[PDB]
Amino acid sequence: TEKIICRDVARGYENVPIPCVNGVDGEPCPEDYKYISENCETSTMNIDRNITHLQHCTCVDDCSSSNCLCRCWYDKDGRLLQEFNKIEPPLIFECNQACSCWRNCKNRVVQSGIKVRLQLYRTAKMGWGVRALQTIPQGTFICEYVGELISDAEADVREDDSYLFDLDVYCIDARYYGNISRFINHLCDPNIIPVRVFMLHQDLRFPRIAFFSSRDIRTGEELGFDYGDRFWDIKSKYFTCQCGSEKCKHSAEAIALEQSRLA
């Protein structure tokens, strides 16, 4: 039987609680990491936080016009536009503290936090995973990939390379410090896309990673994104993809078929 292990893995840090369930095995709530809601530093990074360096708008409205300096890819409901390049996404510049606009303007989606109801759950083959507890329309903001900010050289020397997100060159490592997104599994048929966002600062070395639904997501459906080739070139030697989709490109079988395809 499916049991609710933890009522909130975020410990009240998010807008909504993120419960943890397990109806697959006897694994307890993971506690080998520190849940953080915002990105952290473990060495001097000196993020350029000069308020005068911020590109900002002069809008006195809610920022729905084409005249907003900060195109604005959000619609009235905070969703990415249908015409948004889900293949090669542009950089998003949300409104900030230098903008003359109100805190509740239409260009502050990611900075307003988690709004969708998510659950941490035990998958059959991929350990822990994240699923939707509600229907999620296309282009809705899900969560941010939060972790520890580190150099690519620091990433290369890390014992655990399982929770790394490449920024461009810098990485977010969610191994020791992370949020709900450190539990999102790889899918060869993904339903979320990562987006580089700028909010309170505009230092190009450190974009913030925001996940948006790339299609309408059904209740109970597992969230996942394409981890990319860098992860799968390192990791395939140790384990293969268990997504079980008909389009799987990293399975063991798919790996055996392409290795045999040449000869």
State the minimum distance, in angstroms, from the CB of residue 183 to ligand SAH: 5
Run of H or E residues at 21: strand 20-22
Interaction site with ligand SAH (CB under 6 A): 126-128, 162-163, 183, 185-186, 235, 239, 241-243
Say whether residue 110 binds Zn ion (CB under 5 A): no
54 binds Zn ion (CB under 5 A): no
Residue 241 contacts Zn ion per CB under 5 A: yes
Which residue of 8, 62, 75, 166 would you call a contact of ligand 2OD, by CB under 6 A? 166
Min dist CB 52 to its own copies, Å, is 5
Residues 181-220: x where in contact with ligand 2OD by CB under 6 A, - otherwise, as a string: ----------------------------------------
163 binds ligand 2OD (CB under 6 A): yes
Whole-number Å distance between alpha carbons of 180 and 177:
11
CA distance 263 to 258: 9
Under rule CB under 8 A, residue 157 binds its own copies: no
Q: Is 141 left (phi over 0), alpha (psi -120 to 50) or beta?
A: beta
The structure tokens listed for 38 are 């915002």
228 near 249, Cβ under 8 Å? no
DSSP state of 26: S
Pairwise CA distance, residues 33 & 100, whole Å: 39
Q: Pick out the residues of the known binding site for S-adenosyl-L-methionine.
A: 126-128, 163, 185-186, 242
